[PDB]
Enzyme design. Structure first.
Site, short mmCIF file in Angstrom:
data_model
loop_
_atom_site.label_atom_id
_atom_site.label_comp_id
_atom_site.label_asym_id
_atom_site.label_seq_id
_atom_site.Cartn_x
_atom_site.Cartn_y
_atom_site.Cartn_z
CD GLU A 1 -3.20 -0.44 0.34
OE1 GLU A 1 -2.97 0.44 -0.54
OE2 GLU A 1 -4.34 -0.91 0.53
CG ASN B 1 -4.34 7.07 -1.74
OD1 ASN B 1 -5.23 6.65 -1.04
ND2 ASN B 1 -4.33 8.31 -2.23
CD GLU C 1 -3.13 -1.33 -4.19
OE1 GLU C 1 -2.95 -1.84 -5.33
OE2 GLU C 1 -3.41 -0.12 -3.99
CG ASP D 1 5.12 11.22 19.05
OD1 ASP D 1 5.69 10.08 19.02
OD2 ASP D 1 4.43 11.58 20.04
CB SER D 2 4.22 7.40 15.89
OG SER D 2 4.51 7.00 17.21
CD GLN E 1 -3.89 9.30 19.43
OE1 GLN E 1 -3.66 10.42 19.11
NE2 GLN E 1 -3.53 8.81 20.62
CB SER F 1 -1.61 1.77 17.02
OG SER F 1 -1.84 2.78 17.94
N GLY F 2 0.97 -0.11 16.14
CA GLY F 2 1.29 -1.39 15.55
C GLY F 2 2.36 -1.37 14.49
CA LIG Z 1 -3.84 1.45 -2.36
#
Ligand SMILES: [Ca+2]
Length: 223
Positions: A52, A54, A62, A171-172, A174, A177-178
């Site tokens: 991925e 977009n 994809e 920063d990272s 919401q 996450s992961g």
């Molecule tokens: Ca895509």
């Protein structure tokens, strides 16, 4: 990712989006069949989306593969986020080429000061909300254990490290996450938690992947 940059399509080939009708978390491809993510990202009915850029447009690289199994760490505590790691098995093996590739697990832990790449489709604002469609990236250093503990008294375990910038702005956040923290070509962290995003004196907190390599390998070997 707040204060980052547009990675470029398929420049982070191990980055996955976890989808349950919508993107909800990142993850990292570690072999043709397995993804590492955060335990706090657990849910049923995950589709793993590899290749991925977009996440709202089919662009041609994809691979969408449903999960067959999720394994949250045996000692995950959702209150403290200690042991915030989870493995996800794909129903079929991903096709690997330069745009979809696994990331190596660490053989040694990384040190404070090491530069890493953090990536994801999470919020790009520190106040209010804007979600990008294309993958965002941030280069950030690992912070000392002492600065991390000082920032988050009573909260940092031996299974966590801080990375980022104490001044704020980068920063990272919401929705990241992961997802991965990669240092010198190794997966050293997983986006775990923080107080807000990009706040002064509140860096990102990441799962310390090097502590989990034995568990990851043994789990893959028997599942
Ligand atoms: Ca895509």
């Amino acid at each position: 990712i707040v204060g980052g940059y547009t990675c470029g399509a398929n420049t982070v080939p191990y980055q996955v989006s976890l989808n349950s009708g919508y993107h909800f978390c990142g993850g990292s491809l570690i072999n043709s069949q397995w993804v590492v993510s955060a335990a706090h990202c657990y849910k049923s009915g995950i589709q793993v989306r590899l290749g991925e850029d977009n996440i709202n447009v089919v662009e041609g690289n994809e691979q969408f593969i449903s999960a067959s199994k999720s394994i949250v760490h045996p000692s995950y505590n959702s209150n403290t986020l200690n042991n915030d790691i989870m493995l996800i098995k794909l129903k079929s093996a991903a096709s690997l080429n330069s745009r979809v590739a696994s990331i190596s697990l660490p053989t040694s832990c990384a040190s404070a000061g090491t530069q890493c790449l953090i990536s994801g489709w999470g919020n790009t604002k520190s106040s209010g909300t804007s979600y990008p469609d294309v993958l965002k990236c941030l280069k950030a250093p690992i912070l000392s254990d002492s600065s991390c503990k000082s920032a988050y008294p009573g909260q940092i375990t031996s299974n966590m490290f801080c990375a980022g910038y104490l001044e704020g702005g980068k920063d990272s956040c919401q929705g990241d996450s992961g997802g991965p923290v990669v240092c010198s070509g190794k997966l050293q962290g997983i986006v775990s938690w923080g107080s807000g995003c990009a706040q002064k004196n509140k860096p990102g907190v990441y799962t310390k992947v090097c502590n989990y390599v034995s568990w990851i390998k043994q789990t893959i070997a028997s599942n």
